Symmetry: C2
Subunit: 278 residues, 2 copies
């Protein structure tokens, strides 16, 4: 984790993509009347984010030869779903967070009822937004495949199952595979689909995204024991040293999925794995 030129480039990449994503999200949920609805939806959606999921979607679409523009509504859709899951996670019945990124959580602003409902609205808006924009830009069979992939990433085979179970090691990887990886996989596969890429590229980048998600969760535990005096985790299941080994194996596994792609087009995803691992 040493090459600073690619890190500088990627830092700039992140800022630019996040800016583009924030503009498109702002436009995706217009401040139109009835404000009661739109405001509660917008509050959590337009709060500051690293936007790694829509960024991954965009980067993958570019990798296989596509444009940011073409990938943007799918990218926004995955950020909407991710936002919905955060709203419900923060709820008193679940995590009971007062704060999110330093700012009051949704239910703390609008009430619990409104927060539940806002989560529901965001789930529906993802499918609507993605389909209504993307259907004009890709073959209808691809559009249908995109809808299926999104829906599957959300459900009993994806995000919701992972949330429910989160209430030995194989269990921890189950949680991480479902809460984090499924929606990242969705983001990457939607990237390939929106970029006109092949079935092979779809599975390669699905694998890439799975590695990236797992890597994020391992590195999160490492960072916590490494920087919280209080600190079920990887360093307490298999040690801190082996935890770092696992992180590094995951990162190299992600990187190998990008072999044979155009170096230039591959650079942001190489750098994304490096950024996460360090």
């Amino acid at each position: 984790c040493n090459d600073h030129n690619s890190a500088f480039d990627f830092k700039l990449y992140m800022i630019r993509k996040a800016e583009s994503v924030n503009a498109a999200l702002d436009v995706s949920v217009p401040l139109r009347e009835p404000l009661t609805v739109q405001e509660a939806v917008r509050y959590s959606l337009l709060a500051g984010g690293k936007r790694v999921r829509p960024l991954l979607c965009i980067a993958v679409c570019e990798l296989v030869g596509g444009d940011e523009a073409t990938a943007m509504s799918a990218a926004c859709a995955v950020e909407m779903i991710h936002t919905s899951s955060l709203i419900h996670d923060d709820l008193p019945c679940m995590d009971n967070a007062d704060l999110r990124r330093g700012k009051p959580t949704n239910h703390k602003v609008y009430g619990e009822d409104m927060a539940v409902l806002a989560g529901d609205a965001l789930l529906a808006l993802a499918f609507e937004h993605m389909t209504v924009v993307s259907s004009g830009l890709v073959a209808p069979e691809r559009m249908i495949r995109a809808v299926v992939e999104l829906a599957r990433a959300i459900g009993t085979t994806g995000l919701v199952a992972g949330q429910m179970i989160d209430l030995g090691l194989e269990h921890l990887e189950f949680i991480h595979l479902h809460k984090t990886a499924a929606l990242l996989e969705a983001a990457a596969v939607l990237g390939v689909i929106m970029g006109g890429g092949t079935e092979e590229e779809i599975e390669k980048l699905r694998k890439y995204a799975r590695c990236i998600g797992l890597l994020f969760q391992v590195v999160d535990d490492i960072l916590d024991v490494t920087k919280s005096t209080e600190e079920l985790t990887y360093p307490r299941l298999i040690g801190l040293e082996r935890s770092k080994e696992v992180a590094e194996k995951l990162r190299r596994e992600a990187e190998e999925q990008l072999l044979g792609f155009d170096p230039s087009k591959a650079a942001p995803l190489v750098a994304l794995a490096s950024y996460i691992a360090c």
Copy 2:
């Protein structure tokens, strides 16, 4: 007279094939499903999946072809019931004499179960129907379902309901009741191979029917129609809604139209 009894039998038949399909759609065999099935298979009138099927048949389609869309609109209906029962909203301990979802599984599981049903509606409808219909229709079906649920659909209705009269009330009823019925009907026309012009007619029918339901419910009960516009004008609104619904059924064979005429009647004469 007898025609209403025929419709009763019709509803019972369609409901039982919908219940079968719903059972199959959330396979109990796990690795979550239990919380979902508990509310989804609890039993209802299944009026929205019936509307979907009846409308598919109307335009010359099959029950089998519309069944996944019908199940999807029932999953969405079921989702909104689970979320409505929650402590933070209607705080109901019971539903049809039976404990509500959060009372069996906890509020967190209930919330999650609602979210799962929302995703499963899209996955199930799209995987099965795509399937049986041209891809452009499938796409349009996804857009209609999505539009019925959110900020211009059911959730908008719920949010505004949490809060002088007629504009507000019509908004709530149109979004909280009508939007999803409209989805059921339009999905019926789409899966049935019907035309755009049949779509608009049946969207209109579903709308009249949903509104009719709420107006008649307010009339039976003597922020309502009779207090905002009077009892007399409420009965007038009910009658023109009923008849508006029937006029959408012009141009179809009487026999195929019969269950939708009968459903309009059944909502009118409660």
